[PDB]
């Protein structure tokens, strides 16, 4: 409540880094007598590897490792709630192929691969979910693809022009996030922030703020404030 | 064109048969081990003309068949290009005798 006390330090070994951190929190389950059981929260992490590691917070170590045949993972996110007992991690990686992992009853195994982009040089650098079945991935060929999880299809492909500030003609969408009212915020490499309306997946505003590239975003819970760090 | 097509089909079946027979005549394999001691045990266990004539013969036969199939393929392509040059309209394809490539962007209406 404003104390900010660092509880626990779990260090990893030499030559190990950490890129993403995603908690998964189950819904509030009810007991037989009306008592409430809050969700059991688990911690997943990627380490610039082809592996997702689930950490045991009680044991103060890693619990499981999971590895599918793909590229090294760069970004990932949990499917949010609509179903209840069936929520899945979606991970975008370097070679492009959206791998999809399952987590049920405390298990972490590589379920399948949704798609892969046609170009091999397409690298997936961000991911955020619009709804229960629609994933928004930010791709280093100046691209923001909107895929659909159920059939694994490609709803649309929003795009951005070149950067006209310097050379290096590809822009890079370093982060995306989703507002509550369906719209998608996207921090890119021009130091812009692009608001895309999500009923049609198009751009509706470009805002130039930073001088160098945007690196991360955050949304208000109701969807009124946008924080952009670059 | 029809005659060259038939001869190419025959030559393709013969080339398939001959490559099969030649392969049948004549870091690839890897053996895994749990430890260096077991690998050294395996190395200890390891330390403890007519086929050439028939292989050179089949190789020469395969090379002749390949050359024949390539010649028939180039002939079939040349005849398709002659059809394209002599078609009833401006049809793309094939080089002229001057070197410029015939290329028309009209749609065959």
């Amino acid at each position: 409540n404003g104390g900010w006390y660092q509880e626990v330090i779990i260090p990893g070994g030499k030559d190990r880094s950490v890129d993403g951190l995603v908690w998964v929190t189950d819904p509030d389950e009810e007991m037989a007598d009306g008592k409430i059981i809050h969700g059991k929260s688990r911690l997943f992490s990627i380490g610039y590897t082809t592996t997702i590691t689930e950490w045991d917070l009680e044991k103060a170590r890693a619990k499981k490792h999971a590895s599918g045949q793909h590229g090294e993972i760069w970004c990932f996110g949990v499917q949010p709630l609509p179903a209840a007992q069936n929520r899945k991690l979606v991970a975008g990686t370097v070679d492009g192929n959206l791998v999809l992992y399952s987590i049920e009853d405390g298990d972490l195994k590589f379920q399948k691969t949704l798609t892969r982009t046609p170009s091999k040089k397409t690298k997936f650098v961000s991911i955020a979910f619009q709804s229960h079945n629609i994933v928004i991935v930010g791709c280093s060929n100046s691209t923001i693809c909107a895929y659909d999880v159920r059939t694994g299809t490609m709803l649309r492909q929003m795009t951005l022009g070149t950067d006209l500030t310097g050379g290096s003609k590809n822009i890079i969408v370093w982060a995306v996030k989703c507002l509550p009212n369906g719209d998608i915020v996207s921090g890119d490499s021009t130091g812009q922030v692009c608001i895309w309306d999500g009923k049609t997946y198009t751009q509706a505003q470009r805002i130039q703020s930073h001088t160098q590239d945007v690196l991360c975003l955050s949304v208000s819970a109701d969807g009124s404030k946008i924080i952009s760090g670059g | 064109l029809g005659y060259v097509r038939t001869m190419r089909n025959i030559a393709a079946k013969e080339l398939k048969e001959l490559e099969e027979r030649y392969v049948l005549a004549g870091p690839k394999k890897i053996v895994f081990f749990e430890g260096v001691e077991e690998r050294q045990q395996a190395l200890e266990k390891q330390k403890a003309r007519r086929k050439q004539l028939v292989l050179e013969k089949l190789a020469r036969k395969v090379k002749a068949a390949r050359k024949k199939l390539k010649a028939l393929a180039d002939a079939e392509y040349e005849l398709e290009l002659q059809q394209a040059k002599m078609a009833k309209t401006a049809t793309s394809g094939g080089f002229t005798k001057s070197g410029r490539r015939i290329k028309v962007r009209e749609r065959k209406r």
Binding site: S142, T143, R156, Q157, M158, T159, L160, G161, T162, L164, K169, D197, T200, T202, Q203, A204, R206 | R105, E106, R107, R109
Partner: protein, 226 residues
């Protein structure tokens, strides 16, 4: 560059296509009387914006971009209303948009013509465009495969009855189509009608005079009586 641009029939806005392709083309909208940038509409394609047109009441604009996509993007909410695809056009090249009495929410322009690079010109009805939602695969009122080479210039009548479309790369590629019947006029142009290599066409304001200008640099005039 500032080459391709179009002024709204309301005369308040003017649109410029940016030269920034990268798989997706944008165009800036400028208030005319002050010549100031007011908005920017961006569509996704493969080389950018082929062509576009203001709507008849001048509130939105329709952008036909290559790889066959078409976006209707309005001025009021200043975001994309809808997106559809021309039926199998391997790449758009030019578009035009005219007529009266259409969908009042899409600007009230009844007919939209899209000419691809294959020579095929599709003519769609913009009441049939509506399923605000847009049908992703609308069916053309009529597909024209008369011209053989890439469609260069398209213009409607200001009265919304005639549609002239012409290809330049062949000597005399020009046809004239009555609307809403969508039938090609067969008695003109004849084999000896001195068009040339039709580079630009223009109908007069009362739709009485058709003006055609060829690549040699001569302009010719035809009265259009019925």
């Amino acid at each position: 560059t500032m080459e391709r641009f179009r002024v709204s029939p309301c005369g308040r806005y003017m649109a410029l296509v940016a030269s920034d392709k990268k798989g997706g083309g944008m165009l800036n909208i400028i208030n005319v009387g002050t010549m100031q940038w007011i908005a920017q509409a961006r569509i996704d394609g493969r080389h950018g914006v082929a062509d576009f047109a203001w709507w008849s009441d001048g509130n939105g604009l329709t952008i036909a971009g290559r790889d066959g996509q078409v976006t209707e993007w309005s001025m009021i909410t200043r975001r994309t209303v809808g997106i559809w695809r021309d039926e199998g056009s391997i790449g758009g090249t030019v578009m035009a948009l005219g007529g009266r009495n259409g969908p009042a929410e899409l600007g009230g322009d009844r007919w939209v013509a899209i000419g691809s690079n294959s020579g095929i010109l599709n003519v769609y009805d913009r009441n049939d465009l509506i399923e605000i939602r847009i049908k992703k695969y609308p069916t053309p009122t009529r597909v024209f495969e008369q011209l053989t080479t890439s469609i260069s210039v398209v213009a409607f009548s200001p009265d919304g009855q005639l549609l002239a479309f012409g290809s330049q790369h062949k000597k005399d590629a020009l046809r004239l189509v009555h609307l809403p019947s969508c039938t090609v006029y067969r008695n003109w142009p004849t084999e000896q009608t001195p068009l040339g290599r039709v580079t630009a066409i223009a109908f007069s304001s009362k739709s009485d005079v058709l003006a055609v200008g060829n690549d040699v640099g001569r302009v010719r005039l035809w009265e259009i009586r019925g």
